[PDB]
Design a protein around this nucleic acid. Sequence first.
DNA 1: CTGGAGAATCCCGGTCTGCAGGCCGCTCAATTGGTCGTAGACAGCTCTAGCACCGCTTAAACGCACGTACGCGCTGTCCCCCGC
Lengths: 81, 79, 93, 93, 99, 107, 107
Amino acid sequence: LRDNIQGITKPAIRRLARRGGVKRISGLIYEETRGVLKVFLENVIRDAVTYTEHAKRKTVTAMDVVYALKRQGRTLYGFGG
Amino acid sequence: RDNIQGITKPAIRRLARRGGVKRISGLIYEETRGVLKVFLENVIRDAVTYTEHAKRKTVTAMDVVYALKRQGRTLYGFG
Amino acid sequence: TRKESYAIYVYKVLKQVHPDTGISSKAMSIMNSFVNDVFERIAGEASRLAHYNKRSTITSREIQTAVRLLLPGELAKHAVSEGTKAVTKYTSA
Amino acid sequence: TRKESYAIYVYKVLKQVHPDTGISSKAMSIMNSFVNDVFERIAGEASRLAHYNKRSTITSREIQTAVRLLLPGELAKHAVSEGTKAVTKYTSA
Amino acid sequence: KKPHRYRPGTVALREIRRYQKSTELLIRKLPFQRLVREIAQDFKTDLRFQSSAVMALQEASEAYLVALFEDTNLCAIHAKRVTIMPKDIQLARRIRGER
Amino acid sequence: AKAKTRSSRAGLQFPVGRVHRLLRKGNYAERVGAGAPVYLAAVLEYLTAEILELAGNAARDNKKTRIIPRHLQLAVRNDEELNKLLGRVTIAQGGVLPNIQSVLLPK
Amino acid sequence: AKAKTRSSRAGLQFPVGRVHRLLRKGNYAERVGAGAPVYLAAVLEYLTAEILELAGNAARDNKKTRIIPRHLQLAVRNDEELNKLLGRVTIAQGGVLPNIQSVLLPK
DNA sequence: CTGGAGAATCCCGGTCTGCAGGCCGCTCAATTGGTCGTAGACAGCTCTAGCACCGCTTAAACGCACGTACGCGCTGTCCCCCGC
């Protein structure tokens, strides 16, 4: 598993910005977006894995993700509750 | 009764300076007055709620501490 | 095993207000999660209130105080009215 | 009546790290507030964890997990080391 | 005998309208799962994953990214501009508290 | 006498007994008062009625007979107080409000 | 035999017995592990020592023998991990870090 | 201003299908009734601090004159992002 952050293609970020209400986009944005997304994903997954390990489990559940998001002040509905 | 005008422009300028602000427009002062008023309502409402639930008539500092804490603004040095 | 939820009561209320409106499963789970979250918020605030006042009981007064603290304006007032009405009805009957 | 605090223990810790540095009352008041804040944060997170795994007991493992979740990086590692060392020393003693 | 091309920007507005009404995910699922597993590799090996978990991460990340894009658009407009600059993103994240 | 549900006694759709059980099992306090679960059930029922009413209005506006997450998001975000309450909540498959800034409009 | 403090057994300065009592009375769980209060007191003592060391350094840099809230604020804001930990914490009379933007400087 | 032209979108039948919702058996969690212990509701007492007042004093706010630099409008250039 190497070089997957390039998997987020430029059209994907373009669609994300269009949903975000962005009309004109600079070309040197996408790598910054990828870095920020990587930071966010790392922060969430760290706590998710911490929860999974404290339960002595080997698979990560969505419910662990729910707790991790809740502890970071980002509550998500519709994934088990 | 216009205690909102008790917040004179020198105090606003001083706060901006501590905030690292160099040049200030003249329209700023009233905007700060309004924003500060909104903040004060938000805190004081909860403070009075806590004071009333305790069936008290005097607001204690601990009430303000709880109100600030539940708003995401933790304060130390008062209990 | 068996898991419980608020699905039946949510469906009852839906038929009460919009008798001719269906609901998808995902949305239904969304309401379930929403109810759970509100429950936790009110319960935690009530527990903090009780601990602050050095009390052993969670009464309806604490619930009302927590509702006032956690709800914005008109929502808080209407919820307080509803809770007081329900408490009065239950006490009378 | 009498109110307890952490003044003496913080004073001893200060004398350990800086055996000559004094302190003002406002500073140790802030110290006690910070100590209480950290205590409540860790204890609440540990209780949340215990309820998460359907367990009635709070052990040192729960506190270790809570500290790992609440403290960032090197602080978490060092605190884990301190807690483990203290636990091992107390159990051996 | 003309290409009949639309002016720069109207297509952007049309796709903004398109994507502000839809709700589906905008990212390919397989690359996102691969990246998620790659990131998780650095915390613990041989980790298994529920699919609902990966969907949860994808939804949360896309929502957060949309919010950040909306804030960045306001920041750039405050600079009386139309194109988004990375400095706008940095300022927005700093103001949010993430920096 | 025959069992009569406390929800019926207070005339509510939500299970007061389950609420009391959860209150006792949540480690929230040593003892739980008699009327507190009723109050909480009433509040939850009222809030549920509010959100369901708005969601049904939105779904009928979209001309569908079932409420989907999109309608829920629209109802929550369009209401000022509901959006204020759910300020930090992410709704799965909720989409976004179709809002476009004026300066980017073609002039 | 003679009473010996559990803190001494663990070699700590923070009162383990008080911590255990507060844990019991804090309504966190029905039962409390025996090794819990020791762990918590150790973590608290470590953090206290860290921030006290930084504050003493700051006070010495000000040629003052007593730590003031300004020293505490400076130490907390200067330490990256400590500042992140107390991100939403306001310290009374702590002031702010002396920082001026480059563009406002005379050129 | 203003028709055409082309592309984009809407809409209305027509068809298929997964799940929303209803039905059913069962069981365990809610209910009912009675016991008992004890938390707090309540009355009563004390005395602290919060409120109000008054008189000085002086630092700060205020008003104003004045001058300049900066926010803003305008213009020309180019490059780089968009439509394809």
